[PDB]
C-alpha cells in the first residue's frame, strides 16, 4: 500500500554497514517501494541534497533540515609502528586534525600520512593488505583478523575520539508516505534494546 | 631513489580488491613516494582525468589514453540455498548500459521479468545487500570473497554461452612515464596482472 520510490543518499561507509541492515527491514514491510541508494562524501551528498528525499551523513547536523542523531562511533588505532605507512582518509579538517594531533601525542614522531584515501571502506582494505596502520571508527572494524592486528583505543585527554552519524531530511518530505516510513523505521532501529 | 607523489583514480570496487595488493608491493618497492587514491565511477574518474596520473577503470578502453587490458571478471548469479528466486528483490548497480542490458537479458532469458527493485550506485554497496538478505543479485567473480557459501548458492552467468565478462583496464599519458614514480606504478601493474 506504500509504494513510491526513496532516494537515499548517504556516506559511503554507511551504505556498506548500517544500511544494507536497515534495507532490509524496510524492503520486507514496504516491498512495493523502488529504492535507489547513492553514496559519497558528507559534502558530495549535501552538495546534492535536492537528488535524495533522505540523507545519512556523518559530521554534524546539516542546514536548513530536520535532523536525527543515529549514534556515535569510537575510533581505533590498529596495527600488525612509528616506521610503517600510516593511512589516512578523507574527511572534514576538525576530526582529521583529531587523529594527527592524537598520532602526535601518542606516538614519537611527526604525523605524516604516506598514502590518503577518499573512503574509510578503501581505508580499511588497505589495511587488511597489509600496507599500513590507520585509525578506524569501530564500526567499520568487523573481519579485521584479531590474530594479526592489535586494536588500541583512541582517547584524547581521556575522553574517546567519537563520531555522530546524522539522518537529514526536509520535514515536509514525510508528506510521502515511503519517506515517513524510512524515517520511522529508522528512529526504532537506532535505538538500543 | 624513487618519490614524488602518484594520484591514482580507480573504479570503486578496484579500490578495494585490486588496489590494496598492489599498493602493498608498490610500498614496499618504493617507500618514498605519496600515495593518493580516489575512487569512484569509470565515467567520474574518466571525467576527471586530469587529477590523475593513472587510472584504472571498467569497461572499455579509455580514449587519447595509452590502455593497459589487466584482467577479465566472470560473473555469478548468486541467491540465498532457489527457484522461488524470482518472488525475492535483485539488486542493480549502476555501470553503463550495455553491460547492464546483459545482465537484465540473461534474467529475463533464464528465469518473470526483470525489474530492479533496489538500486546502488557501487558494486560493493550491492555485495553487503547480498550479504544482509536483502536480495539476489549478480556480481562479478572478483567482489565474491567472503560470501558464506554455506547460505548462498552462486550459479554462473552465460549467454549463448559464453560467460558474461567485463574488463579492467588501466590507462594513463605515456609523457607521465617521465614520472619516475608512476612509470614504476605502470612497470608494477604489468607483472602484477600475469599469472605464474
Given at each position: 500500500e506504500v509504494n513510491g520510490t526513496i532516494s537515499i543518499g548517504c556516506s559511503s561507509l554507511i551504505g556498506q554497514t548500517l544500511l544494507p541492515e536497515v534495507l532490509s527491514l524496510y524492503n520486507a514491510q514496504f516491498p512495493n517501494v523502488e529504492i535507489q541508494v547513492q553514496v559519497g562524501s558528507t559534502e558530495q551528498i549535501k552538495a546534492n541534497?535536492?537528488?535524495?528525499?533522505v540523507m545519512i551523513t556523518r559530521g554534524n547536523k546539516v542546514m536548513n533540515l530536520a535532523n536525527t542523531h543515529l549514534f556515535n562511533d569510537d575510533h581505533y588505532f590498529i596495527f600488525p609502528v612509528t616506521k610503517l605507512p600510516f593511512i589516512e582518509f578523507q574527511a572534514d579538517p576538525i576530526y582529521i586534525n583529531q587523529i594527527k594531533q592524537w598520532y602526535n601525542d601518542n606516538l614519537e614522531q611527526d604525523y605524516h600520512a604516506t598514502i590518503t584515501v577518499d573512503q574509510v571502506a578503501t581505508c580499511k582494505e588497505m589495511l587488511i593488505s597489509g600496507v599500513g596502520v590507520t585509525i578506524l571508527?569501530?564500526?567499520?572494524?568487523?573481519?579485521?583478523?584479531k590474530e594479526q592486528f592489535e586494536f588500541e583505543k583512541v582517547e584524547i585527554d581521556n575522553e574517546p575520539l567519537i563520531r555522530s552519524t546524522f539522518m537529514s531530511y526536509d520535514?515536509?518530505?514525510?508528506?510521502?508516505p515511503q519517506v515517513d516510513s524510512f524515517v520511522n523505521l529508522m528512529a526504532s532501529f537506532v535505538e538500543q534494546p
Amino acid at each position: 500500500e506504500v509504494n513510491g520510490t526513496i532516494s537515499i543518499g548517504c556516506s559511503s561507509l554507511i551504505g556498506q554497514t548500517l544500511l544494507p541492515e536497515v534495507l532490509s527491514l524496510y524492503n520486507a514491510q514496504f516491498p512495493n517501494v523502488e529504492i535507489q541508494v547513492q553514496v559519497g562524501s558528507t559534502e558530495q551528498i549535501k552538495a546534492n541534497h535536492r537528488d535524495y528525499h533522505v540523507m545519512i551523513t556523518r559530521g554534524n547536523k546539516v542546514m536548513n533540515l530536520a535532523n536525527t542523531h543515529l549514534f556515535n562511533d569510537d575510533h581505533y588505532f590498529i596495527f600488525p609502528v612509528t616506521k610503517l605507512p600510516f593511512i589516512e582518509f578523507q574527511a572534514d579538517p576538525i576530526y582529521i586534525n583529531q587523529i594527527k594531533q592524537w598520532y602526535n601525542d601518542n606516538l614519537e614522531q611527526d604525523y605524516h600520512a604516506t598514502i590518503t584515501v577518499d573512503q574509510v571502506a578503501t581505508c580499511k582494505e588497505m589495511l587488511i593488505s597489509g600496507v599500513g596502520v590507520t585509525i578506524l571508527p569501530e564500526i567499520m572494524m568487523k573481519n579485521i583478523s584479531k590474530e594479526q592486528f592489535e586494536f588500541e583505543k583512541v582517547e584524547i585527554d581521556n575522553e574517546p575520539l567519537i563520531r555522530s552519524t546524522f539522518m537529514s531530511y526536509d520535514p515536509s518530505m514525510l508528506q510521502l508516505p515511503q519517506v515517513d516510513s524510512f524515517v520511522n523505521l529508522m528512529a526504532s532501529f537506532v535505538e538500543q534494546p
